[PDB]
Amino acid sequence: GSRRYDSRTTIFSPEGRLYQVEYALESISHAGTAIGIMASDGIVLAAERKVTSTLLEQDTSTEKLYKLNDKIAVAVAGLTADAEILINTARIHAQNYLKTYNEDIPVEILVRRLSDIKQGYTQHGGLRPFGVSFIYAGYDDRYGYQLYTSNPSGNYTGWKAISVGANTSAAQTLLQMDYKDDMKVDDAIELALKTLSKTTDSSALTYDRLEFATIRKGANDGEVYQKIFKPQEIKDILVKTGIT
Amino acid sequence: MDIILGIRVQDSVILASSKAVTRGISVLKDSDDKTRQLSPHTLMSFAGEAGDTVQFAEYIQANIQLYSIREDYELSPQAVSSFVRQELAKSIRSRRPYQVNVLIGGYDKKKNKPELYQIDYLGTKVELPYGAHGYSGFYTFSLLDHHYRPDMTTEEGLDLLKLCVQELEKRMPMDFKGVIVKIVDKDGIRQVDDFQAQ
Amino acid sequence: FRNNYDGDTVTFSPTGRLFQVEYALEAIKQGSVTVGLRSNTHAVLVALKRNADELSSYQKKIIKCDEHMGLSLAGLAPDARVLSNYLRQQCNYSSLVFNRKLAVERAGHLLCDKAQKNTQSYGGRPYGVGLLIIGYDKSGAHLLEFQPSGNVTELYGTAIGARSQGAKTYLERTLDTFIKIDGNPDELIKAGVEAISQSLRDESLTVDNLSIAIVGKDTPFTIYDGEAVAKYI
Amino acid sequence: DRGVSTFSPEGRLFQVEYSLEAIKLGSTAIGIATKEGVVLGVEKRATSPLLESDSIEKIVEIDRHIGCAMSGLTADARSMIEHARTAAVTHNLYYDEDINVESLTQSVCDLALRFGEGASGEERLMSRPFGVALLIAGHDADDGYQLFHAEPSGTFYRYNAKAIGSGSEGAQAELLNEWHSSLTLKEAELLVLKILKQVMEEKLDENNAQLSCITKQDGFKIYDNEKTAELIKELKEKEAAE
Amino acid sequence: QFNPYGDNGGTILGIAGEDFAVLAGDTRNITDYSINSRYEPKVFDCGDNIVMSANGFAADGDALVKRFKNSVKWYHFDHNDKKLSINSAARNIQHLLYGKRF
Amino acid sequence: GTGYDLSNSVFSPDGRNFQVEYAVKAVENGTTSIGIKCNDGVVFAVEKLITSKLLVPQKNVKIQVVDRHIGCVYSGLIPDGRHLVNRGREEAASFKKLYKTPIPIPAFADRLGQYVQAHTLYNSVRPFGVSTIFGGVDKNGAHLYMLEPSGSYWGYKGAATGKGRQSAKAELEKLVDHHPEGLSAREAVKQAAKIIYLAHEDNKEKDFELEISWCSLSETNGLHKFVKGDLLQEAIDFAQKEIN
Amino acid sequence: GYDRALSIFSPDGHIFQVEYALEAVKRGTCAVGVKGKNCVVLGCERRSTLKLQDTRITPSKVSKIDSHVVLSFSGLNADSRILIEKARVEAQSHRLTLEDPVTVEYLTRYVAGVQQRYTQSGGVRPFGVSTLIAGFDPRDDEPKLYQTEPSGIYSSWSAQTIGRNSKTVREFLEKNYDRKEPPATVEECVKLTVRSLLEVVQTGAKNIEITVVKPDSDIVALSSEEINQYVTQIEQEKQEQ
Amino acid sequence: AGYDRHITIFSPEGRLYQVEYAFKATNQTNINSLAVRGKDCTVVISQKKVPDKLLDPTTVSYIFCISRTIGMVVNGPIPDARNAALRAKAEAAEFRYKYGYDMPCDVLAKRMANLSQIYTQRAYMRPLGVILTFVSVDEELGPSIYKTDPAGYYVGYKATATGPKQQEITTNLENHFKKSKIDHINEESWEKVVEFAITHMIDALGTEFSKNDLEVGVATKDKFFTLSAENIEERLVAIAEQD
Amino acid sequence: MTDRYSFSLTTFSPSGKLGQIDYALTAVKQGVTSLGIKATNGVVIATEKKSSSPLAMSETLSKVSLLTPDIGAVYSGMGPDYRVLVDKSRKVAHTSYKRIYGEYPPTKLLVSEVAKIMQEATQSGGVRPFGVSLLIAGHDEFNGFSLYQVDPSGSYFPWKATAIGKGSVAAKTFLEKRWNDELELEDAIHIALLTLKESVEGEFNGDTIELAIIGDENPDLLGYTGIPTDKGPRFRKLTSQEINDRLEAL
To answer: Is 3.90.870.10 the CATH number for B1-198?
Structure first.
């Protein structure tokens, strides 16, 4: 029969581990770094563009920061292609919730469904897991600003500051060294840029190799706003934080 | 039909519902409660076809309780009413539709306001100060159109109700065996066990 | 060698063999002996029922499929159930639809084809039981030997199971004698019991150890056990 | 690897065999039949002192005249019990009569070989065989009191006395000598209680052991701790008696 | 339109004695004003000393008897030739019938 | 590498299908059977080994009929052969049902061919362990065919397969050369009984029973029928005589 | 589609995939439950491999199946969600069809069944989770504590622990809990639980979370303080000697 | 890991061995074939080797009539040859039924090619050990030759050859066209084009043929037919009276 | 029968790689070179028609295909895989867009669709990834012109210019030098022909080079008149002749 070529992507190791999940994480470890820092008045998402060129069109590019809702966004680390299949089902789940309840989907609810989908490939189907880890940055009126992270295993947790992808150990330590609860958005923005700047495997941290997004509640309005920075925007903020 | 009335005053919603259950020639019961609590601050009255009526209400109940447990949070009335309108709008175009009309009354602990929703078996939903299903509306809407004020107190509202129940016993053909009243407010849902002479 | 070609039934060995099927056949040889023989008027089955402890019972070896047909088994008892049960339906279908008794020759063809299906598709497993079917139809008495491979054969007599060769030889020898035991069941049954005791060794056939089945001209396939088989031991 | 429904060169089904091994590692279970009823006994076997020993159910009721004891992977027995119970109640709904003990047994055995990844015989969906054996005991108007041994192989035998589980091989030997067609229910009760004491790693008491029986008059009943504790005492005494 | 049902007349009678019972029926089969047969048995011996008769629409009557007898056959196969009690037969027939309640 | 003979649809480096070849082993090892295409029909003959005196004579019949005008005989795994015939029977019924006309031997051939060829396409099935000789009379003549476990088949004047496969092929070729003008059905029957007796020398260890059937326009009315009684004894003698 | 038999027998009669499922449990954080005389308490530890978490939002370890029953676990987190959800739905369904909330014993037996099922169903691996289910039956005051594991086995305990170093904390409880006289107070029952966890938590005020369940849907989860206090008082018990 | 040679998945070099081994099976018949385009007809030549004397020569063939206008010649084992042929005939009939006009030779090729590409990507489907040469006189394209392989590749040709000695036949024609400077055989009648085909076959393979060593197919406007022993015998004589 | 390969044939290795996607990319590397360049008023894509026999007619084959009247594609890798992907691409542009909004999809989205197809061929049961990479170029009213590259992994990214296949490395470098954000379409066509010349061993003429452009609307290529808003396809494949004429000003 076919049993001969079956990798059995869904079994336990003698140590009670899930090979595929493990290996998929190993894959994610070589993915561009992404950090999520949650301040008191907003949230910040920043990621490093893996592999770039003089010819790469950056104004049209987006390989790590995706808008799911109007109040929820995600930073990706892993297989972009895999990420999209999941990103799209999330955008739909978001809309269904709205259509049914006539209210915006609570950040955690969207996160749990997405993580349940991953968990599935982990327990049945003989299919490989999604080589992806997410940092969800959203806001709702039941918990306000929230920062979540989910990985191939289908598990998710909340964070004040967190990073995924490559050099996470280094990034986490640096964050764990300078993060303060009373932080402000711009503070977070700086801590963010600086952390990357120190974990980067590249020479310097230029704007063309970055993606930036913030979820703030512009006082002169009263509504939370998502802003995914444009190349010229990242370039400015880059000079200001003193990285020129 | 049965008597299903609903009135939203200043800080609460009042639901009146006939206690009679007649089957053909005989009135089988005079103490029937045509209502289900969906959550600590959301009550739903219903009237319609013999089986559909309860099966739908309980089904809707089970789902809202499940959402509460799963989210450890209580869905706003508005949201609960949207879930219900959806369920009926599905039912209307299904194989054997639910013939049930409902009134949904709840207190939004976040907005700190009472809300009343009227939804029919077609999935028609509308928000109102006061509403009713069946023929009841026919004699009570003009009463309320006349004597209703948004800032009325629960007491004032309970009187306006007694006024309606009176007109209904006077002009309506059927003996509906009185009504069961319930109040929904910031503190929850309680029944006015003394209206049979209030 | 053999290790690389016996993982399932959908694989042929380089010499054109189907081991899984062959291992199945093995289950039969490991099974308790049973004998079958017929004349022109009757067909008989004789089986040696085996037991677990001395506190246990002697597992049944003979199953009736209809008023004119039945079989004895050697091997996986559960499979005999599945197969005899399938044969019962087929006997039943013939009655209900055509108001016709299923011919033994046809029952055999049906069995063969059912078995075969389980030796050419992935996922299946051959049956691990051997059957001796006797029956009286429009063309007289009949005896069939069914093997898990799918091969069903019509004989005058035969035996299957552990030490079966003893009885088979005795029959192969007594042929011209028993094939003529017409109008006398008790005699065909004795030639039956004798042939089977030719495969004994461990013990001697007792009353709650021996089992006889007989079908024929005016004899609806009936089974005999215990006290009933007394007059033959 | 090698199909779950593969045949060994000796003519056996690997999965079924391995299944029997897991059974040997199971708790002890003994059954004795007498013209006065059938007695079933099991070793609770608590993996800790904090474990409430009576939440350990290894003897269940199929019907009022049928009960069974289980040995081996017991979570597996759950669906077998449900099936057995349904089969018993169902037979009654359709024939307005009690299900014969053998047929109830035969019914359970029919689920046994229903396993594989595509076995060409029907729609046998169940990845592996059951890892538990059963002792079925009851009474019916056709063959009175009966004890049955049902295995993951799909076959079953009838016994006058039978023990399955970790101490079986020896305990069965005991029964071979002890049993006799004239035993009384009480005798069988003490005998079961005695054999459990011998094979048990623990000191037999009314908390890591449990009895029960089936009588035509009161049907299947499971002895509560007190009733058992006493029988245990009455056993120690007659033993020291010589 | 196609009418799946018909009427073949006939009448049956059953009386129970102290140690016996009788089940009788005429042997006429009709269709409207025509006689299909002056002799077409309607009462059958299903075995285990059980006599039966399903009267009304002959096609349905035979289908039922046939199905019941087939039930008695398997009852034997299943419960080692145990005799099917008259009351058990009764309960079984109730299921045969109600099985086609619609 | 190696192991190209463990799965049924795999091509070895030289482009073969070992499982199919092994299937042939099962065939060559079987009883010998032949077909002779005469001037207005075809004759089928087969060797039936008497494994013991216990086998009832004239019973375990091998030759099979498809519909009313087609005859089949095969060597190898018997159960496999019946399975093939059963499929031909439905295959034929299906054809007649829609086209009214009984199925032409040529068309029937390809029906069997496509079926068998199909069992060499997937590793979830095993190839047929039988080579089949079949044929009959149709709208335009008589046809003889032979189908190989690989799915291959061609039209023959004479055909043989099994243990005595070479003795026969030799004898058949002799007939072809000594009858450029054709052989009659009557003659093909006797000439067939001989070929079996001669091909039985590669199995001379066990005794055997002969079986012949024919489909002749002038002898059977284009219908398939077994040669029994007298005509059979006659051919039996004609062989017994020339065997000495 | 996919139906490969993943949980099968090996020569020694073991289902390795189920055993490996248990190993995943041994690795998960620790969880404990002790029943008092009028309540049941569940305590769980929180990993520290990383700390910069937002405990507000981060999913907690003790879940409510219904208003009178809770469930904590040890093993893979993702896998727990599937089990919790299934049991939550069964809770509502049972009310609807029987007009009466599930008993703790029942809700437990259901969860165990799901697990057992995943051990002999083709195409799926067993759940890398073991659970503790506690609460009070409807209109009953006697506390209930149950435990389930991948194999599908379950039973009730006076106190029990699962997870890493559960071997330790179990020993602690085995020689600190008397069935004769159970922690007659909600207070001393919460204490015996923190004490038992401290045996392995190694100073972790923010690493320990408690939840007390009382008869008639009275469930509440203590905050760091209420817990921290218990820790403080316990450390003095040691020093005062 | 080493099973990237048993099913159709990638090997480290980015190759699909099973596809390659399938190609290997195409030469199994040890028969060569070639096709050339006339001015308004297409001809296909193929060797025919009936060794056994018990065979009925009339039943042996690797040339198929897919439709009234499309003919196909197969280089490979016969069971895969017939599977491919049947599928093509069905695809032909269905196409007519659905679109109201006869399927064009190139299209049928593209369809069979895509069908092969699938066995290349799906693991449970093995490729077919055959190369398919389709020919006709398309109502829009004219004389056409389209060939497909187990890889799912296909293209049109001025002429083409397939088989063990494929390369000899190819270079031969290659030269003829390098010479003539035109993409076809400037001949009006098909008999002369059949003769040219047979001739160059002989020159390239360096062999003489009898009337039973060949198999010829011709595609003309609104019809594709195959020649009989005699039709060839007559064609063979013609080239003989030129040498 | 019945596809019993319901499991992934592409799984994760202990190192974290996805073998088949890797090997698939290797196959892309081996393939013939093909490139793309975005100008200010058009885009151009080209490759080499590497005839596989002088007897084969390279015209009866397109390496540069039309997806919609404003989107063209080209590849590097396995021809048959590209072929079926073009068909699937043309279909999905209809079934999932034109049939809903009554207008052809915009480059990014159609590209997004193709990517999804490939991604699934990376995780679905019993299949291997696609052994090709595509350079898709097109234009839509709200996005202007664009050029995307889609890999077997299912990933894709926008480019000002780029190349793939055999001499991609060399070609890329050469392009990075010549490209600027002020190129007119003709300039890019010229640059294209230049870049291509390096990767071409043998002949280099309009019969061995296949090139197409996404430029202005060709009303002359519409086929009908009388509908103001319908201005004609922007995608136009160049003719053998058109190529040579430029090869002279090379």
So the answer is: no
